[PDB]
Design a protein around this ligand. Structure first.
Ligand SMILES: C=CCNc1nc(SCc2ccc(Cl)cc2)nc2sc3c(c12)C=CN(C)C3
Ligand SMILES: *[C@@H]1O[C@H](CO)[C@@H](O)[C@H](O)[C@H]1NC(C)=O
Length: 377
């Protein structure tokens, strides 16, 4: 059992996965309670009054989604509510909050009351990102760093006496880490830090690359866009291994390549890949969309024999990079080797939970669980 093990497995749940057709629909009762130690509900948002508020009242309240995910506390799972996410991080509103002590003080007391009203065990902070708003370090002031650290302290000071958890999802990018995070403060006060060791590459690069490399590859533009560098950098900056949970993607980054005739890494790209029929987002495909393309549409798979990164797959002018069971096992052995706090997945509804691909239900998440529970390293 994961709950009796020395590791966390932090699973993100997404309310918007309900609005998908056919087998892509995911509801709270699709959560498999044997596969997670912690569930984090994405997302609540920052209202115009500076207070946390539900993003989707129809699902979260009227259809009782908050209650139906908090249900999983009955299995011993800790259920937190996440605030923010990529879309909610587009503007200045989190920066305005954290730079205003009076606004922080109002926010904190209301946020704890909100968590207690719905029965959540904690709050997960998902501002992407302090200073570097949506990765753009030119947008925010340097004082976002101190402001976020003070927000974390003020939340900790209310949550910890009530026995409530406080965590954050954080950037894997050296420049963002340096600009946005007072790492010693966060490492001391947070119960865990979920490092988002994915989205290192995507359509925005204008060339193909892997969503989530584990180790440096000789053709990389930088030495730091890989999970091994990122995790060691969080530790070098002052984070204890026990506080780190390493993110793993249940999806791939897709690309429209300029030329069907070359199809390797670092080749020119004109746009994101064509949207999947279930997830409906250019540049993104769920694992259950990728595995079907490979199994039933003849996409060609290229693996890295040194296992520095997972596979990519292509057909015509479409190309996608993603994690398979093999690289997941390697990544979990890496987690164990460094004695990290555990693993994290984005997100439950993107793995093949329906066994559309015939590899079993939840092939990626089950691979993580099995490797975490395996004593050998
Ligand atoms: C057009 C700009 C938007 N780009 C992005 N979007 C996301 S949201 C993912 C998501 C979630 C749910 C569903 Cl259903 C579909 C997709 N994440 C990231 S990390 C990153 C970018 C980026 C972009 C540049 N950066 C350098 C790095
Ligand atoms: C992992 O990262 C550490 C620290 O940056 C480095 O010393 C080590 O060589 C890396 N492992 C690789 C590249 O296999």
């Amino acid at each position: 059992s994961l709950l009796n093990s020395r590791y966390k497995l932090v699973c993100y749940y997404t309310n918007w996965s309900w609005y998908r057709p056919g087998i892509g629909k995911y509801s709270p009762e699709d959560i498999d309670p044997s596969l997670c130690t912690h569930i984090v509900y994405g997302f609540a948002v920052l209202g115009n009054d500076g207070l946390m508020t539900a993003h989707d009242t129809w699902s979260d309240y009227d259809n009782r989604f908050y209650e139906r995910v908090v249900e999983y506390k009955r299995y011993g799972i800790k259920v937190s509510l996440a605030l923010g996410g990529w879309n909610d991080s587009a503007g200045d509103k989190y920066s305005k909050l954290v730079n205003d002590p009076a606004a922080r003080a109002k926010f904190v007391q209301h946020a704890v009351a909100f968590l207690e009203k719905y029965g959540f065990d904690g709050l997960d902070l998902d501002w992407e990102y302090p200073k570097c708003w949506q990765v753009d370090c030119s947008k925010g002031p340097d004082s976002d760093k101190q402001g976020f650290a003070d927000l974390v302290h003020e939340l900790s000071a209310v949550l910890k006496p009530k026995g409530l958890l406080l965590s954050a999802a954080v950037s894997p990018n050296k420049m963002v880490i340096d600009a946005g995070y007072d790492v010693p403060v966060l490492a001391r006060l947070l119960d865990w830090i979920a490092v988002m060791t994915y989205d290192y590459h995507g359509q925005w690069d204008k060339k193909t690359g892997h969503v989530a490399p584990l180790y440096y590859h000789p053709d990389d533009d930088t030495t730091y866009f890989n999970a091994n560098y990122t995790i060691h950098y969080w530790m070098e900056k002052g984070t204890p291994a026990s506080k780190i949970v390493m993110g793993m993607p249940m999806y791939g980054q897709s690309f429209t390549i300029e030329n069907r005739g070359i199809h390797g890494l670092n080749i020119p790209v004109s746009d994101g890949g064509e949207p999947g029929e279930y997830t409906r987002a250019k540049g993104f495909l769920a694992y259950y969309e990728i595995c079907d393309r490979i199994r039933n549409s003849g996409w060609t798979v290229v693996k890295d024999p040194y296992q520095r990164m997972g596979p990519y797959a292509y057909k015509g002018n479409q190309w996608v990079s993603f994690d398979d069971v093999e690289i997941i096992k390697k990544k979990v052995n890496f987690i164990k080797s460094l004695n990290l706090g555990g693993g994290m997945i984005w997100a439950l509804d993107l793995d093949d939970y329906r066994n559309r691909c015939g590899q079993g239900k939840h092939p990626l998440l089950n691979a993580i669980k099995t490797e975490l529970l395996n004593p050998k390293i």
